[PDB]
Design an enzyme around this catalytic site. Structure first.
Site, PDB file in Angstrom:
ATOM      1  N   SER C 199       0.825  -1.209   0.000  1.00  0.00           N
ATOM      2  CA  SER C 199       0.000   0.000   0.000  1.00  0.00           C
ATOM      3  C   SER C 199       0.874   1.280   0.000  1.00  0.00           C
ATOM      4  CB  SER C 199      -0.988  -0.062   1.176  1.00  0.00           C
ATOM      5  OG  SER C 199      -1.965   0.955   1.160  1.00  0.00           O
ATOM      6  N   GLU C 324      -9.609  -5.121  -4.133  1.00  0.00           N
ATOM      7  CA  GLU C 324      -8.893  -4.009  -3.511  1.00  0.00           C
ATOM      8  C   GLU C 324      -9.804  -2.970  -2.862  1.00  0.00           C
ATOM      9  OE1 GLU C 324      -5.685  -3.252  -2.928  1.00  0.00           O
ATOM     10  OE2 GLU C 324      -4.726  -4.971  -3.925  1.00  0.00           O
ATOM     11  N   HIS C 437      -8.069  -5.572   0.579  1.00  0.00           N
ATOM     12  CA  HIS C 437      -6.776  -4.906   0.660  1.00  0.00           C
ATOM     13  C   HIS C 437      -6.010  -5.240   1.943  1.00  0.00           C
ATOM     14  CE1 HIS C 437      -3.964  -1.455   0.130  1.00  0.00           C
ATOM     15  NE2 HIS C 437      -4.043  -1.408   1.448  1.00  0.00           N
TER      16      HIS C 437
END
Ligand SMILES: CC(=O)N[C@@H]1[C@@H](O)[C@H](O)[C@@H](CO)O[C@H]1O
Ligand SMILES: CC(=O)N[C@@H]1[C@@H](O)[C@H](O)[C@@H](CO)O[C@H]1O
Ligand SMILES: *[C@@H]1O[C@H](CO)[C@@H](O)[C@H](O)[C@H]1NC(C)=O
Ligand SMILES: *[C@@H]1O[C@H](CO)[C@@H](O)[C@H](O)[C@H]1NC(C)=O
Ligand SMILES: [Cl-]
Ligand SMILES: [Cl-]
Ligand SMILES: [Cl-]
Ligand SMILES: [Cl-]
Ligand SMILES: [Cl-]
Ligand SMILES: [Cl-]
Ligand SMILES: [Cl-]
Ligand SMILES: [Cl-]
Ligand SMILES: [Cl-]
Ligand SMILES: [Cl-]
Ligand SMILES: [Cl-]
Ligand SMILES: [Cl-]
Ligand SMILES: [Cl-]
Ligand SMILES: [Cl-]
Ligand SMILES: [Cl-]
Ligand SMILES: [Cl-]
Ligand SMILES: [Cl-]
Ligand SMILES: [Cl-]
Ligand SMILES: [Cl-]
Ligand SMILES: [Cl-]
Ligand SMILES: [Cl-]
Ligand SMILES: [Cl-]
Lengths: 537, 61, 537, 61
Positions: C199, C324, C437
């Protein structure tokens, strides 16, 4: 013999017996239904044919309406096939009646055919429109008329009394009135009359749906590969007088009266010579003289009417071929000819979009390209072939038809929708074109039955099966046999479910969505975009 | 040379242009409709495109 | 014992032995690598820790960098799991080294972990970042550091000497330098150092790729679910001083010097209290303080650099999870909570697009809606669930990563790409969220191996298999076993072919196209649209 | 009532608000980050949204 003699409100006629495998049919060809629109009558709505003494010979098709002859490919069936076959004349307003043998007793349902040809061409006499097999196989009355085309049919100086516009559609109406009046003379039932057309023919049908003075002239409508709300189908008033005035100047002319007066002095051929100049340009699938939104014949734009209209008590049959856009690409799009496989570069593609989608902002073409590009295979020529064939297909046909189909269903009508996806074994266009615009007709009219043509066995069946579909619709407003298992059922198209069937050599197959994702672009989003790109000038 | 010959309102037909050239008149821009064919080399214009040829024979196709 | 004692350029350390199923590992936790960025040093780049007398206790993680604590769902593992676990301090610049047991002889490859957390949160001490299983199973050296976050890390008054910005990235660099200098002390090979992050962690990695002063600090990069060219990853100079000044005013402050001076007097908590006010607003997946394009650390925008950059001699591993966008939707999008199935109406959908896609013209949302709508099923709540989860997913992650991946491959690098699509059996988020995610990490770090956790047998294997992939990449710059049939081959991602593999419990499967059609919208077309909608004001 | 209690920089914890109400402070607009919880009913603002409650117990969740 015996029943080749028939008398109509206007006078006596003498018909002819046509031979079919299954048996004979009675044809009455070239019946005058209007006073020939010549001299002072050019550009003017049709007047009813005055009655005659004697017996009119109706054994042969009368001259084709004065039109442009498509010569792109000299000696090529695929184009020549729709070319005029009778002599060419302004004196062309005649119609034709086919009827079973022996003439039915009780009144039978009537099918009326309106040919297409981009509103610039066409004839009821075309070999592919022979009504003999359809009448013989499904015993119904078949009628088709000639209507004025090109400038002679659609040149308009809106608000003019000398050139009102839309008179080609008026020709169609006069004939429909003629049918109310005279079809019983052939065993025809004026209380059961179905309209079916193709392309411009279909777009006409759709306009009689939206023009009240015509609503009481028919009871059912079949639109094939066309629709009044197509971008090519109607022109505005401003645009129309622009084109008519351009034509005038081009021909040496010269007040709307003296303009049209002068115009009326020119040979017919001089007018056709300059037909294609008046087009706004850089486009495929666009034509100079088409119906106007004048406020008269149509009171609003076909789209506006379709949205307001109430359609209860109506049954409509709508459909398209599998590859609508294909053949039009050889009339401009770079890299396209019928004499190779038209494997375009990514760069001919991008250029073609501008052609197949006339006057539209730069940002708009990006949006098309965005949608019609396979980003896994952006350069694949074969893929870019089909893509541009779809761009043209969906923009001009599949999305105007699908919109209509959904608006009707939603507002009272009962709709049935099809995709014709079978390529004639006799087809004379290249293979890349697939199942092209206008190649379901020969089957609908049961032409494969003609033994002097070279169709396969399965195909002769196909047409039979198909003719049944059409016949069942005209009689009942429902294509699939009154009561037939274990035959797959053709369900009605609705706004949500969006069901259609795929007409091919396989049995009926039911699909959902008539190019549903593509059409959401053309119908929903694109206009929101053009609204903005226009308020960017 | 044997060339194609016709007008706006007629089918294409072969003809003996013999000595000299042939032409293929059409709409310059899409739709590129063919407007005629015959013997010689006639002026074009903004709307009219004329393609000339002499050798190939029925080349104005 | 024996080798828990180790000496680095700065002084002596005392480590600790961590137990693994497979065997022991040597950990050295909380090594000071910078002079604590307090008092006058707040907002200032880090200074190297001065050397110490004595032996530093490195048996336990040092305090987490002062950050905001996410409390959305009190008592909920799925959110609490990424919350600070050590005490909270500005004095937080410490790093950690894991190394095999016994300490390897010949120098072994080093993995360096940079955690994510939107640049506003994170800690090297998080249970899911335990380096013990990875080091034990693939015998490599693992290092992770803490870096300053939120304002303490990224508040910038561009051109300022008192608050330059980007100092959180500077913290990362100082540690990488520390690694060159000291990793040999643990059996680590400074000539083979691989960066891997997730990330914001991934977006950092990507920035060290684009910042020359860092290029000689590592040799390989793995970006997981993130990238420097993400819309959330960098902010402009104008924007940045807007936010810092807003924060100043919010906190009573008060010339950039006296502004930052005053700012430095406020308690840390007062600063975090007002962190979320300074956001431009109406958005999910956006954060107040992130890296600036100042011209210093980055000389141009990540996109600009990626395009010019030459990348020969580089190997990169890039990937994303299967869903995601999913979990971010509960932070705003109407109708979304974790406590039901978030079956939204067509109307919550249209509203959510505005949220998941911040400040963007009206015409732009239409375009999104156009693409992410199934026009066969426009109202299907379940379908609109996934759709908005993709809108957010693709816009913020999958398309920035896929762009990068293609630009690298095309310009010298060798790239390998994956889609992680396996949902942890222990997962504590609702099922509609799929594989969300940040839930591939626990597997990469081999956490399923921990016997006190409740993972399945196949899963314990999965992590092993996966750790091998990562280890093989760090050693060789190629994930799949040096020479292993009949094992499916993981091919390199290229700009054209676009190949990737799907990491799940099944063997490697090769797919083409990383959301290739969606990304063509986000990357190619949308910016052509915004260019126009902006010149419409 | 037993309610949640914490700040910007602390975990949520149960507490006896007992007599009177609880609150749940957050970012008014997306992202609607929770900024704190405790006893009472404090003013909000353009950026701060405060949701008050009394009955349900741990209702300021
Ligand atoms: C309309 C069209 O595409 N025609 C082109 C022609 O102009 C060109 O010279 C040639 C190049 O090979 O290919 C053909
Ligand atoms: C952010 C969000 O969607 N919260 C809503 C809330 O405002 C609303 O009162 C309720 C209606 O059922 O559903 C929930
Ligand atoms: C197909 O033929 C046309 C006209 O000859 C031409 O435009 C095109 O280049 C050809 N396509 C090829 C050769 O791939
Ligand atoms: C799910 O819960 C949230 C908050 O309670 C709410 O926004 C939404 O209405 C719920 N969805 C339903 C009930 O379908
Ligand atoms: Cl015959
Ligand atoms: Cl008589
Ligand atoms: Cl003929
Ligand atoms: Cl107008
Ligand atoms: Cl409406
Ligand atoms: Cl147009
Ligand atoms: Cl392009
Ligand atoms: Cl039968
Ligand atoms: Cl009926
Ligand atoms: Cl289907
Ligand atoms: Cl589609
Ligand atoms: Cl432990
Ligand atoms: Cl000492
Ligand atoms: Cl904890
Ligand atoms: Cl700027
Ligand atoms: Cl470039
Ligand atoms: Cl933004
Ligand atoms: Cl909508
Ligand atoms: Cl092994
Ligand atoms: Cl190497
Ligand atoms: Cl695939
Ligand atoms: Cl896709």
């Amino acid at each position: 013999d015996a029943e080749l003699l028939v008398t109509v409100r206007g006078g006596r006629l003498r018909g002819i017996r046509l031979k079919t495998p299954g048996g004979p049919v009675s044809a009455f060809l070239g019946i005058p239904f209007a006073e020939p629109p010549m001299g002072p009558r050019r550009f003017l709505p049709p007047e009813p044919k005055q009655p005659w003494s004697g017996v009119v010979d109706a054994t042969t098709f009368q001259s084709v309406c004065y039109q442009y002859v498509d010569t792109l490919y000299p000696g090529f069936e695929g184009t020549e096939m729709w070319n005029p076959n009778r002599e060419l004349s302004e004196d062309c307003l005649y119609l034709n009646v086919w009827t079973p043998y022996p003439r039915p007793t009780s009144p039978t349902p009537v099918l009326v055919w309106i040919y297409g040809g981009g509103f610039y061409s066409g004839a009821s006499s075309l070999d592919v429109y022979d009504g003999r097999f359809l009448v013989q196989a499904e015993r119904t009355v078949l009628v088709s008329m000639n209507y004025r085309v090109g400038a002679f049919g659609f040149l308009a100086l809106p608000g003019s009394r000398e050139a009102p516009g839309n008179v080609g559609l008026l020709d169609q109406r006069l004939a429909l009135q003629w049918v109310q009046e005279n079809v019983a003379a052939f065993g025809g039932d004026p209380t059961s009359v179905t309209l079916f057309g193709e392309s411009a023919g279909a777009a006409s049908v759709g306009m009689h749906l939206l023009s009240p003075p015509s609503r009481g002239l028919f009871h059912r409508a079949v639109l094939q590969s066309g629709a009044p709300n197509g971008p090519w189908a109607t022109v505005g008033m401003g645009e129309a007088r622009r084109r008519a005035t351009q034509l005038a100047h081009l021909v040496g002319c010269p007040n709307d009266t003296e303009l049209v007066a002068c115009l009326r002095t020119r040979p017919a051929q001089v007018l056709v010579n300059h037909e294609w100049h008046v087009l706004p340009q850089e486009s495929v699938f666009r034509f100079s003289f088409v119906p106007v939104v004048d406020g008269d014949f149509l009171s609003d734009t076909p789209e506006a009417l379709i949205n307001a209209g109430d359609f209860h008590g109506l049954q409509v049959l709508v459909g398209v071929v599998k590859d609508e856009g294909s053949y039009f690409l050889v009339y401009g799009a770079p890299g396209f000819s019928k004499d190779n496989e038209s494997l375009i570069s990514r760069a001919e593609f991008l250029a073609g979009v501008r052609v197949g989608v006339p006057q539209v902002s730069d940002l708009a073409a990006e949006a098309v390209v965005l949608h019609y590009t396979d980003w896994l295979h952006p350069e694949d020529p074969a893929r870019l072939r089909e893509a541009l064939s779809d761009v043209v297909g969906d923009h001009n046909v599949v999305c105007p038809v699908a919109q209509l189909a959904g608006r009707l269903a939603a507002q009272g009508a009962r709709v049935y929708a099809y995709v014709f996806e079978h390529r004639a074994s006799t087809l004379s266009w290249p293979l890349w074109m697939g199942v092209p615009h206008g190649y379901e007709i020969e089957f609908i009219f049961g032409i494969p039955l003609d033994p002097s043509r070279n169709y396969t066995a399965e195909e002769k069946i196909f047409a039979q099966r198909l003719m049944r579909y059409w016949a069942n619709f005209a009689r009942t407003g429902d294509p699939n046999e009154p009561r037939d298992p274990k035959a797959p059922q053709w369900p009605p198209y609705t706004a949500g479910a969006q069901q259609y069937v795929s007409l091919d050599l396989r049995p009926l197959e039911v699909r959902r969505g008539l190019r549903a994702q593509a059409c959401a672009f053309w119908n929903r989003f694109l206009p929101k975009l053009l609204s903005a790109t226009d308020t960017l000038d | 040379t044997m060339c194609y010959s016709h007008t706006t309102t007629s089918r294409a037909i072969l003809t003996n242009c013999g000595e000299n050239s042939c032409y293929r008149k059409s709409r310059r821009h899409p739709p590129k409709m063919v407007l005629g064919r015959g013997c010689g080399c006639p002026p074009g214009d903004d709307n009219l495109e004329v393609k000339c040829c002499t050798s190939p024979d029925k080349c104005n196709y």
